[PDB]
Amino acid sequence: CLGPCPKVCHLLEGEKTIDSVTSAQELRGCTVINGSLIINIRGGNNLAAELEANLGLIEEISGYLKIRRSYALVSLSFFRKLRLIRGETLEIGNYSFYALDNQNLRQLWDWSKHNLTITQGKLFFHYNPKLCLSEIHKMEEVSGTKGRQERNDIALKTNGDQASCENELLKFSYIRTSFDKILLRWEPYWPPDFRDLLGFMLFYKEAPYQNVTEFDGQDACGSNSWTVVDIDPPLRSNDPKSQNHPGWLMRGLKPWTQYAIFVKTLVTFSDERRTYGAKSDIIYVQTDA
Amino acid sequence: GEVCPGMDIRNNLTRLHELENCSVIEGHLQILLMFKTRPEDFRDLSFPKLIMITDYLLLFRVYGLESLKDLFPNLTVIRGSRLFFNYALVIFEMVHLKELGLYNLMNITRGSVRIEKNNELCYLATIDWSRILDSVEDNHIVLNKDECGDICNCPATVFVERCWTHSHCQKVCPTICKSHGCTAEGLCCHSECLGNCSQPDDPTKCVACRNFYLDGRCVETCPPPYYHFQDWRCVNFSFCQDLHHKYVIHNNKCIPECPSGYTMNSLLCTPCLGPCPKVCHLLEGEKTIDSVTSAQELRGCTVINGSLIINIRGGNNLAAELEANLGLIEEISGYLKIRRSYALVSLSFFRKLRLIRGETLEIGNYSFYALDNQNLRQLWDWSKHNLTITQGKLFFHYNPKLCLSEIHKMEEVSGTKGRQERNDIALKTNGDQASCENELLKFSYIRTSFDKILLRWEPYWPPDFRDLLGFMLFYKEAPYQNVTEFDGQDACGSNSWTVVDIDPPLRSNDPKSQNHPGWLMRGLKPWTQYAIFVKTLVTFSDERRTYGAKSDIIYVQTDATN
Amino acid sequence: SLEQEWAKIECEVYGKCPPKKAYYDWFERQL
């Protein structure tokens, strides 16, 4: 046409539940959804390919968008060009975007590329174990909800249980080795407010090979395989050039056995933009003969 | 005189205006960090009523002060029960002090002297600590000015003359007056006396005594019913009892707390009288346990006179410490709530909790409350344990790994079902992640092809066949027969269970149910080994027994074609 | 020894100084 003429697809009573391929295919080519969309994908089988072939042309949702109990869906990016959630109808609680119990959701849209404005309504995020807080906070800024001070119900404890989002990187400056004790010292790390550092937490696991990953064990997939040695915060110096490198002497090791080790910061929430925490890479130390 | 507690005054003359009419102090006196103080301030300050300090005396950075002979002149003896790191006299960083001046110091019962980094101090070598302290080996007197030229009639001991100031000698009396005191003429005081007395051979004229003081005449030991207190006075039973009520009797001495292995019985410290009950009272009827320290606060609290909240967080299991501390609680007078227990897999650390009285209840009239416990897998072992609830409802929500079987057994043990409590137990938020099918399905007949596997299993029907919604066949690649059972999350390996819903067969023929259900899988690959099991899909209800059946995993293989 | 090196470190970083310096620790804590 000359002038826009999108394929508006009208939903029964303003809601449509997408559970399988057939439910998604019913919205194939529906560039505008004149209702609310519920995604409830079930089963350990990922349908992201079929969801993008069918839902990936939707660019507007006139109602709310809810993703609840989506197991195999690791990403909402199958909404390949969803740019607007008008929120004319809202999920109870005045929510325009809703995300609950999504067990393997790792990311939303790629906010480095994608845009998604919300005309009205709040954001909701609960019990998304893999989805990081940073992924959600970027949505609050892109969606304009933060730009209109929406009291988004996004519980910090319930999301990003398994994920790790430490922008800062800790580097070990001292690795002395004995047959049963290793002395480590990492760089000094401090949040903007030094009191937000409640402490460090060392994580050392004896490794047969140098292939251990921090996400392994931390995630529910693998049982946790690290020694969570929590460490008190260091007595801070006024002079930044006199901040001694904190460290720990982990005890009771085995002779010439290789340990996989990393250290992480325990930083309390500071509201708004978090002061953020730091984490070291996995380092391998062979102790001594 | 009067009785005054321990005071810590720093840079506060107004706070100081309190020792003008007091004689003894049952603590420590710390005058330090005084920089505004000036000689003019001190020249008109004197406290001759103070006699003995119990714990210790500490002096630090007191400007303007040059001599202590006029501030505290009548100090004679120091007990030294509570020592400041094994020290009874602390003299540190005195930039304006010239001499000690304490010309009335006689003996030190317990403790040492600490003199370090004190400039401009003199008259240090003229003090005989041997006649004052029993063991001068722990004395630390270094880093001082003492050429001073101490000019003292004064006695001379091992020979150097002993004196405190230029006009006051050191009181050194013969051996016979070793500890009983001594007057100016050279006669010892009463056998119970100490330091100095006004009249020789008189126990009612001594201001300082080694033994306990009682009614002027110092006594060797406190006669009943006077209990020892602080090792210097003999207070009555009603005296230290009032101090306890805004102190417990033990070995003829009302001490603040009983030693290890004793407790107050309603004062006397005794451990078991008849049945032994410990009642721990909670602030405003609630106490939250989140860490080892919060649990240890309830160690041995057999009876909790309040409500208990468990909020343990983090992945580190504290069940061992929780059982060492909470595992002796046998009654909770309030409600019991468990919330956000990420790591706690079992409440069995309440090793002998038998009753939840529910006198106070969680809002909603709940006596037991369980919410958001991520890894709670079981409650108490109801095969062994008992736990009655006197009143109040049960609450269970969002306990993903706690199967409803454990919850329903609690409803029957706790008596809530026995009084028809409308327990708020969310049937599909507790134990959803855990399959609790207790009956078994066996694959009666297996047949395989290069692309397909035909399976049949034994027929199954709940007590009411209408409660059977169907079956669920789970199949997955299994190159190794190590596939762990389906635990509500498939497996950690990238391969995931393929769920196939199967509507139930036709109820037909004999009550033998001669209709073996079956399914034909078709999307399979040759050479490939597959793990398969079948689960039932059954309508749950207050029939309370339609738990369903589940097969063991079988590792069928397909045929191999070119 | 390695423990001795950390003994010093504990005092240096965490303020866990020997019992002989516990007395000095109080003065640092004061004010």
Asked if A246 lies within 8 A of C13 by C-beta distance, the reply is yes
Question: From A231, which residue of chain C is nearest by alpha-carbon distance?
Answer: C14
Question: Any CB–CB contact under 8 A between A253 and chain C?
Answer: no
Phi then psi dihedrals of residue C23, to 5 deg? -65, -45
User: Which of A249, A251, A253, A287 to substitute to test the interface with C, most C CBs within 10 Å?
Assistant: A249
Contact criterion met (CB < 8 Å) for B84 and C27: no
Residue in the structure block whose two tokens are 């809002």: B363
Residue B2's nearest CA partner among B22, B19, B27 is B22
Set of chain A residues whose Cβ sits within 8 Å of the Cβ of C2? 176, 178, 181, 183, 249
Resolution in Å, one decimal place: 5.0
C27:B92 CB<8 A: yes
Mutation pick from A46, A68, A100, A101 vs chain B, by most beta carbons of B within 10 Å, is A101
C21: nearest CA partner in chain B: B85
CB-based contact B496 A228, cutoff 8 Å: no
| Amino acid in position A48 | A
For chain C, say whether B349 makes contact (Cβ under 8 Å). no
Contact B518, B544 (CB under 8 A): no
Distance from CA of C20 to the nearest CA of A (A): 19
Which residues have CB under 8 Å from B440's CB, separation 6+? B549, B550, B551, B552
Peptide bond into B225 cis (omega under 30): yes
Q: Which residue has the tokens 């023929």?
A: B509
Q: Give SS3 for B55.
A: coil
Q: Nearest chain A Cα to B499, which residue?
A: A43
**A197-206 and A227-231: which strand pairing?**
antiparallel
DSSP letter string, B460-519: ---SSGGGEEEEEEEEEE-SSS-PPPP-SS--SSS---EEEEE------SSTT-----EE
Q: In this structure, which long-range contacts are made by residues B86-90, counting pairs with CB atoms below 8 Å and at least 24 apart in sequence?
A: B86/B111, B86/B112, B86/B138, B87/B56, B87/B111, B87/B112, B87/B113, B87/B114, B87/C23, B88/B56, B88/B57, B88/B112, B88/B113, B89/B56, B89/B57, B89/B113, B89/B114, B90/B56, B90/B57, B90/B58, B90/B59, B90/B60, B90/B114
Q: Name the β-bridge partners of A214.
A: none
Interface touch A249/C2, C-beta < 8 Å: yes
**Window B:48-77, CB contacts with C under 8 Å:** 60
Q: Which residues contact B346 (CB under 8 A, 6 or more apart)?
A: B319, B376, B377, B378, B379
Nearest CA among A105, A116, A101, A97 for reference residue A48:
A105
Residue of chain B whose Cα is closest to the Cα of A103: B489
Most B CBs within 10 Å: which of A45, A201, A219, A225, as the mutation test of the B interface? Answer: A45
The half-sphere exposure of A48 on its side-chain side, counting CA atoms within 13 A, is 17
Q: Is the dihedral of CA A256, A259, A265, A266 positive or negative?
A: negative
Search chain A and give the residue with CA nearest B493.
A221
Contacts of C23 in chain B (CB under 8 A): 84-85, 87, 114
CA distance B53 to B208: 11
Nearest to A130 by CA among A155, A154, A164, A156: A164
Give how far Cα B412 sits from Cα of A156, B337, B356, B420, B431, Å. 37, 19, 14, 10, 18
Could you tell me how many helices (H) and strands (E) chain A has, helices first? Answer: 4, 18
Bin A52: left if φ > 0, else alpha if -120 < ψ < 50, else beta: alpha
State the DSSP H helix or E strand holding residue B109, giving kind and residue range, or none if neither. none
Closest residue of chain A to C9, computed from CA coordinates: A247
Nearest to B85 among C23, C30, C31 (CB): C23
Q: Do the beta carbons of residue B543 and residue B463 sit within 8 Å? A: yes
B20 neighbors B47 (Cβ within 8 angstroms): yes
H or E stretch at B64: none
Nearest to B341 by CA among A203, A133, A157, A227: A157
Nearest CA in chain B to A72: B496
Q: Give the number of beta-carbon pairs within 8 Å between A and B.
A: 19
- Strands B227-229 and B233-235, by their bridges, are antiparallel
Which is nearest to A35 in space by CA: A54, A53, A48, A17?
A: A17
CA dist., res. B419 & res. B228, Å (int):
56
CA distance linking residue B358 with residue B48, whole number of Å: 61
Instruction: Please report residues of C whose CB lies closer than 8 A to that of B85.
Output: 22-23, 26
H helices, E strands: number in chain B: 6, 37
Domains of chain B plus CATH, in order, are: 1-172 (3.80.20.20), 236-270 (2.10.220.10), 279-425 (3.80.20.20), 439-557 (2.60.40.10)
The bridge status of strand B279-289 relative to strand B303-310 is: parallel
- Show residues of chain A in contact with C5, CB under 8 Å: 176, 183
- How far is it, in rounded angstroms, from Cα A10 to Cα A33? 7
> How many angstroms away from the CA of B49 is the closest CA of chain C?
29
| DSSP calls for A85-127 | E--SS-BTTTEEEEEE--SS--BSS-TTT---EESS-EEEEES
- Candidates A20, A47, A104, A127: best to mutate against B (most CBs of B within 10 A) is A127
Interface test with B, best of C23, C25, C31 (most B CBs within 10 A): C23
Q: CA-based Rg of chain B, rounded to a whole angstrom? A: 40
Compute the nearest-CA separation of C24 from chain A (Å). Answer: 16
Instruction: Output DSSP code: residue C14.
Output: I
Q: How far is B216 from chain C (nearest CA, A)?
A: 38
- Name the residue of chain A whose CA is nearest to C11's CA: A235
Q: Which residues of B469-479 are buried (b: 16+ CB within 10 A; e: fewer)?
A: eebbbbbbbbe
Q: What phi and psi, each to the nearest 5 degrees, are found at residue B555? A: -110, 70
Distance to chain A for C10, nearest Cα, Å: 9
Two tokens at A229? 């040695």
Contacting chains of A (3 CB pairs or more, <8 Å) are: B, C
Q: Which residues contact B342 (CB under 8 A, 6 or more apart)?
A: B312, B313, B314, B315, B373, B374, B375
User: How far off is chain C from B60, nearest CA to CA, in Å?
Assistant: 10
Judge: B496–A45 Cβ closer than 8 Å, yes or no.
yes
Structure tokens at A227: 């020694």
DSSP sequence for B215-240? SSS-BSSPPTTPEEETTTEEE-HHHH
HEC string of B115-183 equals EECECCCCCCCCCCCCCCECCHHHCEECCECCCCCCCCCCCEECCEECECCCCCECCCCCHHHCCCCEC
- Print the SS3 string covering A141-173: HHCCCHHHCCCCEECCCCCCCCCCCCCEEECEE
What is the end-to-end Cα distance of chain C in Å, rounded? 35
Q: Sign of the C-alpha dihedral, residues B376, B382, B383, B387?
A: positive
Cβ-based contacts under 8 A for chains A and C = 26
DSSP-based three-state secondary structure for B281? strand
Record: contact A244-C12, CB cut-off 8 A: yes
- Dihedral pair phi/psi, residue A139, rounded to 5°: -70, -40
**Measured distance CA(B133)–CA(B397) in Å, rounded:** 69
Contact B85 C27 (CB under 8 A): no
Separate counts of helices (H) and strands (E) for chain C: 2, 0
Is A43 close to B499, i.e. CB distance below 8 A? yes
